[PDB]
Design an enzyme around this catalytic site. Structure first.
Site, PDB file in Angstrom:
ATOM      1  N   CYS A   6       0.684  -1.154   0.070  1.00  0.00           N
ATOM      2  CA  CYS A   6       0.242   0.192   0.105  1.00  0.00           C
ATOM      3  C   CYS A   6       0.923   1.275   0.054  1.00  0.00           C
ATOM      4  O   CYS A   6       0.169   2.465  -0.099  1.00  0.00           O
ATOM      5  CB  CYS A   6      -1.143  -0.003   1.294  1.00  0.00           C
ATOM      6  SG  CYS A   6      -0.159   0.265   2.671  1.00  0.00           S
ATOM      7  N   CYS A  53      -4.600  -3.426   3.437  1.00  0.00           N
ATOM      8  CA  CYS A  53      -3.770  -4.261   2.520  1.00  0.00           C
ATOM      9  C   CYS A  53      -3.578  -5.539   3.126  1.00  0.00           C
ATOM     10  O   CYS A  53      -3.917  -5.799   4.162  1.00  0.00           O
ATOM     11  CB  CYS A  53      -2.417  -3.507   2.251  1.00  0.00           C
ATOM     12  SG  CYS A  53      -1.401  -3.195   3.721  1.00  0.00           S
ATOM     13  N   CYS A 273     -10.760   7.546 -23.759  1.00  0.00           N
ATOM     14  CA  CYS A 273     -10.071   6.990 -25.061  1.00  0.00           C
ATOM     15  C   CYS A 273      -9.709   5.695 -24.938  1.00  0.00           C
ATOM     16  O   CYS A 273      -9.644   4.957 -25.843  1.00  0.00           O
ATOM     17  CB  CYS A 273      -9.093   8.104 -25.339  1.00  0.00           C
ATOM     18  SG  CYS A 273      -9.315   9.751 -25.559  1.00  0.00           S
ATOM     19  N   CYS A 283     -14.242  11.723 -25.585  1.00  0.00           N
ATOM     20  CA  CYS A 283     -12.912  12.375 -24.881  1.00  0.00           C
ATOM     21  C   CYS A 283     -13.049  13.766 -24.044  1.00  0.00           C
ATOM     22  O   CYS A 283     -13.295  14.785 -24.786  1.00  0.00           O
ATOM     23  CB  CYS A 283     -11.743  12.746 -25.735  1.00  0.00           C
ATOM     24  SG  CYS A 283     -10.362  13.297 -24.862  1.00  0.00           S
ATOM     25  N   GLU A 699     -38.999  42.356 -14.350  1.00  0.00           N
ATOM     26  CA  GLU A 699     -37.843  41.864 -13.683  1.00  0.00           C
ATOM     27  C   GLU A 699     -38.428  40.807 -12.753  1.00  0.00           C
ATOM     28  O   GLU A 699     -38.901  41.129 -11.717  1.00  0.00           O
ATOM     29  CB  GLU A 699     -37.148  42.950 -12.896  1.00  0.00           C
ATOM     30  CG  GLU A 699     -35.780  42.287 -12.409  1.00  0.00           C
ATOM     31  CD  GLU A 699     -34.989  41.451 -13.023  1.00  0.00           C
ATOM     32  OE1 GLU A 699     -34.396  42.160 -13.807  1.00  0.00           O
ATOM     33  OE2 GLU A 699     -34.891  40.416 -12.733  1.00  0.00           O
ATOM     34  N   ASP A 721     -43.221  36.200 -15.430  1.00  0.00           N
ATOM     35  CA  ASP A 721     -42.517  35.861 -16.525  1.00  0.00           C
ATOM     36  C   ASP A 721     -42.995  36.781 -17.813  1.00  0.00           C
ATOM     37  O   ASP A 721     -44.095  36.844 -17.999  1.00  0.00           O
ATOM     38  CB  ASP A 721     -42.695  34.431 -16.707  1.00  0.00           C
ATOM     39  CG  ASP A 721     -41.538  34.023 -17.750  1.00  0.00           C
ATOM     40  OD1 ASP A 721     -41.529  34.627 -19.007  1.00  0.00           O
ATOM     41  OD2 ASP A 721     -41.202  32.817 -17.856  1.00  0.00           O
ATOM     42  N   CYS A 757     -29.417  35.208 -23.179  1.00  0.00           N
ATOM     43  CA  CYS A 757     -28.903  34.353 -24.113  1.00  0.00           C
ATOM     44  C   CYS A 757     -28.796  33.059 -23.539  1.00  0.00           C
ATOM     45  O   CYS A 757     -27.426  32.383 -24.226  1.00  0.00           O
ATOM     46  CB  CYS A 757     -28.074  35.070 -25.047  1.00  0.00           C
ATOM     47  SG  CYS A 757     -28.845  36.481 -25.928  1.00  0.00           S
ATOM     48  N   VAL A1110     -26.709  48.288 -17.151  1.00  0.00           N
ATOM     49  CA  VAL A1110     -26.216  49.291 -18.104  1.00  0.00           C
ATOM     50  C   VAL A1110     -25.550  50.267 -17.500  1.00  0.00           C
ATOM     51  O   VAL A1110     -26.568  50.652 -16.792  1.00  0.00           O
ATOM     52  CB  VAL A1110     -27.091  49.331 -19.463  1.00  0.00           C
ATOM     53  CG1 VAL A1110     -26.610  50.504 -20.491  1.00  0.00           C
ATOM     54  CG2 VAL A1110     -27.798  48.009 -19.659  1.00  0.00           C
TER      55      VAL A1110
HETATM   56 ZN   LIG Z   1       0.147  -1.793   3.498  1.00  0.00          ZN
HETATM   57 ZN   LIG Z   2      -9.169  11.411 -24.294  1.00  0.00          ZN
END
Ligand SMILES: [Zn+2]
Ligand SMILES: [Zn+2]
Ligand SMILES: [Zn+2]
Ligand SMILES: [Zn+2]
Length: 1140
Positions: A6, A53, A273, A283, A699, A721, A757, A1110
């Site tokens: 270990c 271990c 991979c 990936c 708002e 909303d 956005c 703003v």
């Molecule tokens: Zn050990």
């Molecule tokens: Zn990769």
């Protein structure tokens, strides 16, 4: 003394050996018990566990030993799957239970069900509580797990969250008593970065949607780069929003999808991979690059080439003959009609086939018809622009054409056919209308991308035959640009002395003042480091791997001397003799002039200069303060380009003497609805420009809507909303839920707002995924509000990159939409810093004006600002679009600095919590005098800053005061962290093969990857004054320049600050002098907010409010352009009421 199985050091005092119970029968024997009663592996609970271990040393599970093939064995009391008892009661004891195959987790969705489990070739176990001895080991594992829960649950709810959002989420989560930790900090997230990230990646593989992986949200990508994470290390497992569109608006986005909608450098090295339609070989390393790449745009390319300048093909001549009597005679002889087999009359439209280099059939309107002196039968062609050739491109109506400033003389032979061209004119009640052949609606300006209302100037009888609007446009423009002499006095030599001249439509008389480049004239001139202790500053070696121009020169006109072109005056060689004005900074005062001085003030100088009229930038009013009927403040605010002097300056004596004797002598407030209002920054500027009144705001976030109420009592502030409030008006409802009076057609004169956005903000081409978001977005909802209400004026404010999102498709579709409604519209980028704020921030602005009003221009920068920050152009389909702004670089006033912004505020310490404090001083800078008012106000509100952790606080105290100092300037020293906690030294144990040794021959590496090896975990140091992560990832991230950086008094804020974090993405955020982060008020000042402006909620709510706004000075500037459109349109009706 290390374990051969270990690795653990025998001298480690925290090391412990395994102690078995009696019963302790091996795995198979344990599994055949009647104490026990959907997978081919018996699931059972398991309490009083211990992992070890072969040599018997208790072991962690999270440390990857299992993965490094190391056999780990376990013991404890196995119970029944339903038995919730964490005591050793209803259970058999087992020992050395078969090597752990793998470990797993579940409960990353529902409740606080985060279950840890072991898998053996014999069975599956759901760990309950650990043994006495193993408890501390499982204790550190429990921490790692809790943090991972918070993070994952937070990201399911809040994707799109920024790094500072996470840090706050973590810092704020109260851990249960069961966790040995009082609270988690940024220092914890950095320590367990590898764990957390690999767990967040695991959740993505586990529960599967078509939704974006959580490891790719902004905060997660920020963590990955900042900490030294290795992606791909695998582990454990276990109705959509509809926009309130209008018919019109719906169809645009619908009839875009139903057309345009079509259909890899993997790292190799990672564990993802290195694994084999099954596919989840995505990936993580490529995914991060792709996501980071998608957030970047392209900011220079030439002026776009003018259309219709190519080759044209001639049609075969059968019978070309004039019909009727000549309309006029000029060497040229005009006619009303002509024959070409069929009939063509002055004012019809024609098609001309070109040399088919793309095959786009040319279209023109027959302006004139005549026979030249050589008997050539001609026509004048006023070209049309196909929609696919305007900024719109593919999004445009294929039957839609546009008027352009392009026309040419051609032989009647080029005409292929006469084409039917209909003008789609707006209705009598176009304003109340909210919900085959070639047509045109607007006039398109290629360079500036302005769609505007057709000129509407009718033919005089003198030019009823020759009438070309493009020729008229060009005429006006040439004569306005022209430097002409108005009134001339007497000539001395071959130079004529005048009393008045003109250019760019501005009249220049004698004694009037002028702007000029700083290079036009001149004034009267003026006239090495030592070694660092690298043991104490080991990171300083990292410190080494164009500023703002001068404002305009100012002078008063003495002579208009000129030249002579044979007969009359040489209009080109107009020269000017001027009296030089000094700015307090130009004077021997220099940088000491510029502080407390009014940005407005000048000094008189009997000094003289001669420059060309071609160098004059504009006109300005320089008046004497003692020969003024009003106070300087009343005068200065009265109008643009207003400067003043009260003294004169002798350059030779360096003295200020009194000036000589020869130096002496209603607006309609549009009724506004502000959707996505915030705390009202945009509404504020527009209020200051006088052009408006905000009666309605929308708002959804309570602290912002509350803050807007505070500042605008007259406004009806809706918090529902905007999609619901729209469905409600599109139903005849006169009132909402709370009985708040809904605005109807005619109520709203101007519509403004900043639509978020959310799911499509990125630069790559659209998908099924990204379009979906955009199709029902708040951009779509906002455009619909515009369609129903049909306001006289429209503004859509956003981040500069709104102009580049999805291959400019978000912009193109927004414009297309405005066009189908019948609006005059345009776009442009503006730099906040150029209008009077100590901050670099660009914004995309989308202006629209209703047919009948005029389309406003973008304001001219009032402040000189660094060129790097002023990149204002936009590339759309590899064509460079620019705005009408002319002041590229220069301007009338000096930049506003961090000093101007906050140098008056009283001292505060880290954690400052008193909202209402005395000012304890008068304003210092011109700017401060402006936001404070020209009177006395006692209270300073919101001079409040965050209580940073004892660790962050200690770092802040150790950042030096010299401008440019950041983390690289920190000392490598032990610091007692307020409490018992002690911030230790950073240990340099690895070679940095790329960075060499320090001057002392010491190592500069902090992790094994500095030597090119893989990261060795637990070489990873935490609670160090110099954060370990920074030298770890320094070489790949430009040494994290700016992180723990103090703002420079002469400098500016990097962006809009919403939550100040020293290792964040919002720039240098520590105070120039004090051992703290910038206060809420300091940010409000950076945003140009008056000191009387009010904010609401907790500290962070007030920070987000300020930062989301703003800046009022940018809004005032835009507002004043609307002023001119209003004034100009109000006087146009008045000079027409007379003619009626
Ligand atoms: Zn050990
Ligand atoms: Zn990769
Ligand atoms: Zn023309
Ligand atoms: Zn490393």
């Amino acid at each position: 003394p290390k374990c051969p199985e270990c690795g653990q050091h025998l001298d480690d005092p925290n090391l412990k050996y395994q102690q078995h119970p009696e019963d302790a029968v091996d795995e198979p024997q344990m599994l055949t018990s009647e104490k026990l009663s959907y997978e081919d592996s018996p699931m059972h609970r398991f309490t009083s566990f211990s992992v070890y271990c072969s040599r018997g040393h208790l072991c962690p599970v999270d440390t990857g030993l299992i993965e490094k093939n190391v056999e780990l064995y376990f013991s404890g009391c196995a119970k029944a799957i339903h038995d919730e008892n964490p005591s050793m009661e209803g259970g058999i004891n087992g020992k050395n239970l078969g090597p752990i195959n793998q470990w797993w987790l579940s409960g990353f969705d529902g409740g606080e069900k985060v279950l840890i489990g072991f898998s053996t070739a014999f069975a599956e176990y759901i760990l309950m509580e650990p043994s006495k001895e193993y408890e501390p080991i499982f204790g550190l594992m429990q921490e790692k797990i809790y943090i991972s829960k918070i993070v994952v649950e937070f990201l399911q709810n809040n994707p799109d969250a920024v790094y500072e959002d996470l840090i706050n989420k973590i810092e704020t989560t109260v851990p249960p008593s069961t966790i040995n930790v009082n609270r988690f900090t940024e220092d914890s997230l950095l320590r367990h970065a590898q764990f957390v990230v690999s767990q967040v990646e695991s959740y993505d593989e586990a529960k599967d949607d078509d939704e974006t992986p959580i490891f790719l949200s902004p905060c997660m990508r920020a963590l990955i780069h900042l900490a030294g994470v290795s992606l791909g290390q695998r582990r454990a497992t276990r109705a959509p929003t509809k926009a309130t569109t209008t018919k019109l608006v719906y169809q645009i986005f619908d009839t875009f999808f139903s057309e345009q909608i079509e259909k890899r450098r993997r790292c190799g090295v990672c564990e993802v991979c290195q694994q084999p339609a099954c596919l989840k070989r995505r990936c993580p390393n490529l995914a991060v690059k792709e996501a980071d790449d998608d957030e970047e745009a392209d900011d220079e390319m030439p002026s776009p080439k003018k259309l219709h300048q190519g080759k044209k093909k001639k049609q075969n001549k059968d019978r070309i003959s004039w019909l009727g009597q000549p309309m006029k005679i000029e060497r040229t002889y005009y006619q009303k009609v002509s024959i070409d087999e069929e009939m063509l009359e002055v004012g019809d439209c024609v098609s001309v086939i070109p040399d088919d280099s793309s095959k786009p059939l040319y279209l023109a309107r027959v302006t004139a018809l005549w026979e030249d002196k050589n008997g050539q039968m001609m026509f004048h062609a006023h070209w049309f622009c196909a929609g696919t050739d305007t900024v719109l491109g593919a999004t445009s109506d294929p039957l839609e054409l546009f008027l352009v400033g392009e026309c040419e003389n051609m032989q009647l032979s080029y005409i292929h056919s006469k084409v039917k061209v209909i003008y789609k004119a707006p209705s009598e009640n176009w304003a109340m209308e909210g919900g085959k052949t070639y047509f045109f609606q607007l006039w398109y300006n290629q360079e500036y991308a302005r769609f505007e209302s057709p000129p509407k100037t009718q033919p005089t009888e003198d030019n009823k035959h020759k009438f070309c609007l493009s020729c008229i446009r060009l005429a006006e423009l040439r004569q306005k640009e022209m430097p002409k002499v108005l009134e001339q006095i007497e000539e001395v030599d071959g130079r004529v002395y005048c009393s008045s001249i003109t250019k760019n439509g501005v009249v220049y008389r004698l004694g009037d003042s002028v702007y000029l480049p700083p290079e036009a004239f001149t004034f009267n001139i003026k006239v090495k480091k030592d070694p660092v202790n690298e043991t104490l500053y080991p990171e300083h070696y990292r410190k080494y791997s164009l500023d703002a121009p001068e404002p305009y020169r100012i002078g008063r006109i003495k002579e208009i001397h000129c030249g002579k072109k044979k007969g009359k005056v040489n209009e080109a060689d107009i020269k000017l003799r001027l009296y030089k004005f000094y700015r307090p900074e130009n004077t021997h005062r220099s940088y000491n002039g510029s502080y407390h001085t009014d940005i407005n003030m000048l000094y008189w100088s009997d000094e003289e200069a001669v420059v060309n009229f071609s160098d004059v930038q504009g006109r300005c009013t320089v008046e004497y303060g003692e020969d003024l009927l009003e106070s300087i403040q009343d005068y200065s605010q009265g109008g643009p380009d207003r400067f003043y002097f009260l003294e004169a300056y002798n350059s030779k004596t360096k003295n200020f003497e009194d000036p000589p004797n020869h130096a002496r002598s209603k607006l309609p407030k549009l009724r506004t609805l502000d959707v996505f209002s915030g705390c009202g920054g945009l509404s504020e500027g527009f209020h200051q420009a006088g052009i408006s009144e905000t009666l309605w705001a929308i708002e959804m976030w309570d602290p912002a809507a509350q803050a807007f109420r505070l500042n605008n009592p007259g406004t009806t502030v809706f918090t529902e909303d905007c999609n619901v409030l729209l469905k409600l008006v599109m139903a005849g409802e006169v009132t909402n839920s709370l009985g708040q009076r809904l605005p109807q057609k005619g109520d709203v004169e101007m519509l403004c707002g900043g639509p978020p956005c959310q799911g499509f903000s990125g630069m790559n081409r659209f998908n099924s995924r990204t379009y979906s978001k955009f199709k029902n977005s708040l951009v779509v909802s906002f455009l619909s509000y515009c369609d129903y209400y049909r306001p006289r004026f429209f503004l859509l404010e956003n981040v500069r990159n709104f102009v580049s999102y999805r291959r400019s498709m978000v912009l193109k579709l927004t414009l297309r939409c405005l066009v189908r409604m019948g609006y005059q519209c345009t776009f442009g980028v503006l730099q906040a810093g150029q209008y009077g704020v100590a901050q670099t921030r660009r914004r995309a602005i989308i202006l629209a004006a209703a047919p009948g009003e005029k389309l406003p221009l973008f304001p001219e920068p009032l402040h000189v600002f660094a060129p790097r920050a002023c990149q204002l152009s936009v590339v759309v389909d590899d064509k460079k679009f620019v705005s009408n702004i002319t002041r590229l670089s220069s301007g009338p006033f000096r930049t506003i600095t961090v000093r101007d912004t906050m140098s008056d505020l009283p001292e505060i310490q880290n954690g400052a919590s008193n909202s209402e404090i005395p000012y304890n001083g008068e304003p210092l800078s011109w700017f401060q005098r402006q936001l404070r008012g020209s009177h006395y106000q006692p209270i300073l509100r919101d001079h409040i800053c965050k209580d940073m952790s004892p660790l962050v606080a200690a770092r802040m105290r150790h950042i030096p005061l010299f401008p440019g100092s950041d983390w690289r300037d920190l000392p490598n020293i032990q610091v007692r962290l307020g409490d018992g906690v002690i911030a230790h030294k950073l240990q340099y144990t690895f070679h940095d093969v790329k960075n060499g040794y320090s001057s002392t021959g010491a190592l500069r590496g902090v992790c094994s990857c500095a030597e090119g090896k893989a990261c060795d975990p637990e070489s990873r140091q935490f609670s160090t004054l110099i954060p370990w992560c920074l030298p770890h990832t320094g070489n790949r991230h430009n040494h994290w320049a700016g992180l723990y950086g103090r703002l420079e008094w002469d400098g500016f804020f990097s962006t809009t600050v919403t939550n100040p974090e020293p290792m964040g993405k919002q720039g240098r955020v520590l105070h120039p002098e004090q051992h703290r982060v910038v206060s809420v008020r300091e940010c409000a000042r950076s945003q140009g907010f008056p000191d009387s402006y009010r904010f609401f909620g907790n500290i962070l709510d007030r920070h987000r409010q300020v930062g989301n706004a703003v800046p009022p000075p940018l809004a005032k500037a835009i507002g004043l352009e609307i002023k001119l459109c209003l004034l100009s349109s109000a006087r146009e009706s008045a000079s027409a009421a007379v003619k009626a």
